């Protein structure tokens, strides 16, 4: 049909695959769109009802702002900016609440699995903070002893990764093409040997070695890319790849309709 795709391996959290019959700008733009443009959900504004702990308030704000959130059903709701409402209706936002107490004699931790959804969830799978390990605790927030109190009111909104790294799903990326340098898009700094002084790529063996003596294949062109996507976990990885493709084409179609309407 066109740009074929081959999966090398996959997991719960990362997809590694091969991309062929494609051009360089296409692949690179896909990379950047995945790293910057995926809409998601994240906690955004926070009201301290009561802080007592040694930990500072804007730490509590900033460190809250970075907890990843469940965002399968992110498309169902809409932006707070475009929303018909004002001040965080259920159909544009979600509300989070935290409670802590210095109960024990020893220090008590406050994990992400303590904040609870409050507002109308309206049956769409949104907002539950991800627990990656197998021991129930989310990610650590704050510690308390015997007298400190936290009472937090939190509001999440849409947001995208372009204006803050909160709203990223991307978390890493990988990229490689022509591991054998047949395209001569670089030449190696060295002092005895390029071949000896550089480690071989891991992706060398999926293409043949350069056959040693044949002249420079000038007419050739880059293809056959090597991607490894590894999401943070706010959304499954197949979803992030497909959504990135979808939002890139949504952008291009938008520019097309703007042109036609002009």
Half-sphere exposure of 4 (CA within 13 A, CB side): 5
Size of the site for Zn ion (CB under 5 A): 4
Among 140, 175, 176, 217, binds another protein (CB under 8 A): 140
Residue 83 binds which entry of another protein, Zn ion, none, with Cβ cut-offs from 5 to 8 Å by kind? Answer: Zn ion
C-alpha to C-alpha distance for 203 and 225, rounded to whole angstroms: 10
Nearer to another protein, 66 or 122 (CB): 66
Helix 237-261 / helix 24-36 crossing angle, nearest 10 deg: 110
Query: Distance of alpha carbon 26 from its chain centroid, rounded?
Result: 20
Between residues 47 and 90, which has the closer beta carbon with respect to Zn ion? 90
Q: Which stretch binds another protein (CB under 8 A): 92-100, 134-142, 183-191, 192-200?
A: 134-142
Report 80-119 residues binding another protein (CB under 8 A): 81, 107
Is residue 57 within the footprint of another protein (CB under 8 A)?
yes
Please say which residue, 63 or 124, places its beta carbon nearer to another protein: 63
Residue 85, interface with Zn ion (CB under 5 A)? yes
3-state secondary structure of 193: coil
Decide whether 2 or 215 has the Cβ nearer to another protein.
2
Residue closest to 235 by CA, chosen among 161, 149, 168, 169: 169
Residue 261's H or E segment, with its range, is: helix 237-261
């Amino acid at each position: 049909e066109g740009p074929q795709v081959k999966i090398r391996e996959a997991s719960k959290d990362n997809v590694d695959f091969i991309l062929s019959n494609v051009d360089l700008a296409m692949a690179n733009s896909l990379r950047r769109v995945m790293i910057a443009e995926i809409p998601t959900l994240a906690i955004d504004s926070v009201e301290v009802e009561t802080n007592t702990t040694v930990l500072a308030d804007e730490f509590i704000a900033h460190r809250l702002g970075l907890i990843p959130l469940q965002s399968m059903d992110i498309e169902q709701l809409e932006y707070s900016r475009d929303c018909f409402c004002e001040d965080h209706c259920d159909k544009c936002s979600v509300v989070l609440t935290l409670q802590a107490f210095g109960e024990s004699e020893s220090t008590t931790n406050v994990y992400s699995k303590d904040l609870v959804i409050v507002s109308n969830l309206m049956g769409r799978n949104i907002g539950h903070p991800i627990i990656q390990d197998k021991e129930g605790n989310g990610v650590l927030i704050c510690k308390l002893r015997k007298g400190q109190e936290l009472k937090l009111t939190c509001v999440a909104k849409k947001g995208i990764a372009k204006e803050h790294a909160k709203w990223g799903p991307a978390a890493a990326i990988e990229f490689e093409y022509d591991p054998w340098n047949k395209l001569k898009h670089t030449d190696y700094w060295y002092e005895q040997d390029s071949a000896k002084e550089w480690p071989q790529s891991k992706n060398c063996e999926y293409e043949d070695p350069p056959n040693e003596g044949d002249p420079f294949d000038y007419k050739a062109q880059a293809d056959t890319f090597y991607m490894n996507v590894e999401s943070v976990g706010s959304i499954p990885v197949d979803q992030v790849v497909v959504r990135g493709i979808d939002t890139l084409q949504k952008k291009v179609a938008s520019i097309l309709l703007a042109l036609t309407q002009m």
